[PDB]
Every structure is written in C-alpha cells, then in structure tokens.
C-alpha cells in the first residue's frame, strides 16, 4: 500500500513496543534494528511482524 | 469564467518575542525565525525548528558581530 | 518654577492617546486652569497637546 | 611576466586549516577553569598554547624553539612528548588541571596523538 505498517517486538519481552513504516517494494528483506524497550530494562534487537 | 486562485495558509505568528533588554527566565523563547535570521550566543539554545531561547535567567541582548545578527543573554546582577 | 495650563479646545474626536495625555495633565472640562511643575516631561506633554492648550508661565 | 589565471594550493591550504579549526572553535566555550588547549604544528616545529577565550589571553605555552627542548636530537614525536610534559607541569604550577583539547585543525594521529598522550599521562586530565 505504498507504505505498509510494521510492528517491532523484543525477544524475551515479545511486546508490540515499536511500530514503523517502510517501502516493502524496495525492502523485501525483513527489518532489523537495535533499540530499547523499557521493561526488560536494556537494549535489545527488535524483530518485525 | 472561473478563478483557480483563492487558497492560502495559516498564520504561524513568527517574529522576535522577547525584545532587547527585557528580563527573561530560564527556558524562555526569544525568536521564531524560519531561516537563521539570527544566531545563537552564550546561554542561547538552537531549537529543533531554528527557534531561539534562553538557558539561564538574565536580560536578552542583541548585537552584530562579523556582520551577522546573534542573540545573547547577560545575567542580570543578583540583588 | 510653575506652569498655568488651560485647555482651550474640547477633547471630542481627538486621538485616543492625546485624550489620555490630557487626562494625565488633569484637565477635565474645557478652559480649566491647572498649575504644574516645569519638568522636561510635562513640557513634552504640553508640546504634544499644544493644539488644545495654552500655556501661561508663572515663576 | 607573471599572470595569475587560477588559484593557489598553499593559500587555500592555510584557509582550509583555519576553516576546519573553526568548527571546533565554534563550540569551544572554555573559561579560566576550563581553558582551551590550542595546538599548532609546523613543518619543523610544534607549538601549543593554553588560553581562556574569555579574555583571549594565554596561560602557558612551549614549543620546539626553546634551546633546552631543541637539545633533544630525536624527532618530532619525542619533541612533542617532551613539550607536552612541559605544558602539563607548567599548567600544574599555574594551578589548572582539567582542560579541553583543541584539534588545532590538523587530523588526529602521529605527532598530535603523541602530544595528547604525553599530556594525559603527565597528569593533565582532559
């Protein structure tokens, strides 16, 4: 849809903490980022969903 | 016959907002300039949108240096 | 020193700032006599409202 | 007969040096408690000053020119280390311990790095 809608989840957490938009046409590979989510209290890569 | 014009924008109400020699308190805004009509000085913050403010009580002071315009705050003497 | 001020024309239809300056001088009704100090500031007042007042100088 | 039809490399070089130092100088707000440590390097000597921009007046400085330091036959790494130690001990005598370093327009590495280290483990924490 020109710009799909993507959620990001922690690994131990598994909490839909971060949400962001992308161009799926030019990025068919899933998005990887290192970030922070509060409750487990430390940085940790977030996955796509 | 019909017109294709007639639309406009809002009115952001920009422009300097604390004038030279005034007494301003911490976290106070000084100007709202689209471009860099002015330039930060000691105790002045460069905003996320080219806005100017003060990081310490005192009296604002304009002044030209090197042919530009820069704002600064002189801390008024403590009574 | 001292000054004698008397308004010689009515305040009606005059610039608002001029009317307020007249109130400052303290002239309520036309042709009122008032005595004031000869300061540069009152001199400026009279100069500004000169078309409405006449000044008679005493002392 | 000389007719200039272009630009000059060394002239633009000096201008560029001043330019690039300008970025850092812009930020630097170094008071008497936190003066700015300026480093100048030549093709034959190195010079360093410690100044408080508030008055634009220096506090202590040294360079390869002084006879005792020139007495060192080594190269400019050794010269820089010795000069940095002199700066450190002069600053200690004057009573200044914490300062900020100015890249002096040159890129970090080599002689500048040696000077920085020497100043660091000479007691000058910055």
């Amino acid at each position: 849809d020109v710009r799909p809608k993507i959620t990001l989840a922690c690994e131990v957490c598994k909490h839909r903490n971060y949400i962001t938009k992308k161009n799926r046409r030019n990025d068919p590979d899933r998005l990887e980022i290192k970030k922070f989510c509060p409750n487990c209290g430390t940085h940790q890569p977030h996955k796509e969903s | 016959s019909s017109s294709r014009n007639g639309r406009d924008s809002a009115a952001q109400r920009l422009g300097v907002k604390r004038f030279g020699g005034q007494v301003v308190k911490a976290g106070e805004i000084l100007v709202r300039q689209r471009g860099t009509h002015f330039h930060p000085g000691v105790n002045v913050g460069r905003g996320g949108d080219d806005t100017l403010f003060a990081l310490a009580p005192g009296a604002v002071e304009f002044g030209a240096k090197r042919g530009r315009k820069t704002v600064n705050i002189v801390p008024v003497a403590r009574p | 020193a001292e000054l004698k001020i008397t308004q010689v024309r009515s305040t009606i239809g005059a610039r608002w700032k001029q009317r307020e300056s007249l109130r400052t001088l303290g002239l309520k009704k036309i042709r009122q006599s008032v005595v004031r100090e000869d300061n540069a500031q009152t001199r400026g007042l009279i100069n500004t409202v000169h078309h409405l007042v006449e000044v008679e100088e005493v002392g | 007969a000389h007719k200039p039809v272009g630009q000059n490399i060394s002239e633009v070089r000096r201008n560029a040096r001043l330019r690039r130092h300008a970025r850092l100088r812009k930020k630097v707000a170094g008071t008497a408690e936190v003066p700015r440590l300026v480093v100048n390097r030549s093709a034959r000597h190195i010079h360093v000053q410690l100044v408080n921009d508030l008055n634009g007046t220096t506090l202590a400085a040294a360079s390869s020119i002084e006879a005792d330091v020139r007495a060192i036959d080594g190269d400019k790494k050794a010269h820089s280390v010795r000069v940095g130690q002199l700066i450190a001990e002069r600053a200690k005598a004057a009573g200044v311990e914490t300062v900020v370093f100015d890249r002096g327009g040159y890129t970090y590495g080599g002689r500048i790095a040696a000077l920085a280290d020497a100043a660091r483990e000479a007691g000058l924490k910055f």
Binding site: - | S1, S2, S3, N5 | - | -
Partner: protein, 136 residues
Amino acid sequence: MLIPRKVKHRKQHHPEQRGIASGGTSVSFGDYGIQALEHAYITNRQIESARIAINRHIKRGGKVWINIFPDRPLTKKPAETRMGSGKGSPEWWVANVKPGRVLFELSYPDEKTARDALTRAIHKLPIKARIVTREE
C-alpha cells in the same frame, strides 16, 4: 506599440502616483525634449501615436528617444458581467508619469522645427507638457 515581452506575472495592483518624478528629470542624450506636468497614465497607443507624429514630420534629419516605456498591465472586466469573480483580463499597457518627467528627446539642428514637432506631440499627448532644453 511598445510592450514588455515577458514578466513574472500578467497583472498588477492599482497604483500609487504620489511623488515627484525624479528619474530623468533633466534632458540628457539629445538637445530638446518634452516635460509633463501632472500625474497621469500614458497608454502604449498614446506613446506610439506621439512617436509617429514626431518622426513623420521630422523625416530625414535627427533621431529621437523615448525615456519612458509602458510596462505595467491593466485590465477591465468585459461588459455584461456582474463585478466579482476574480480579476479581469489585461487590455492595454501603460507607463506612469510624474510631474517634471521628460517624455521625448530630440537632437535636430533647428530649434524652430524641433519646437514645432514637439508641439504636435504635446497636442497628441493626453497630459500637459512643454519644451525644455539641455542647459543647466
């Protein structure tokens, strides 16, 4: 038929005419010229007609100048259209004029014939004017 060949925009606001004409207040180029008196519009048609009147009589000798040039557009809403509905279309171009301006400039041998031609130009012009020479 003088007309600017391209501008930023095809229409301009109403004018302010107040003020004494400063530009070109003194004859310079030729040796004789007209000088207007009162604020007014001058249409491209008027300018061209005056140019024709001057030129065709002067014939061979001498050459003319035109210190003015009609630049600012104008518009007039066609008849039978209730006012409103946006600006009209441009009809003619006009050049402004202020008291004391010089309109035309001539360098021809004889003062009498120069005066005569410029007098016809005056009569064909829309606003008062009069002769003036180079002298201080």
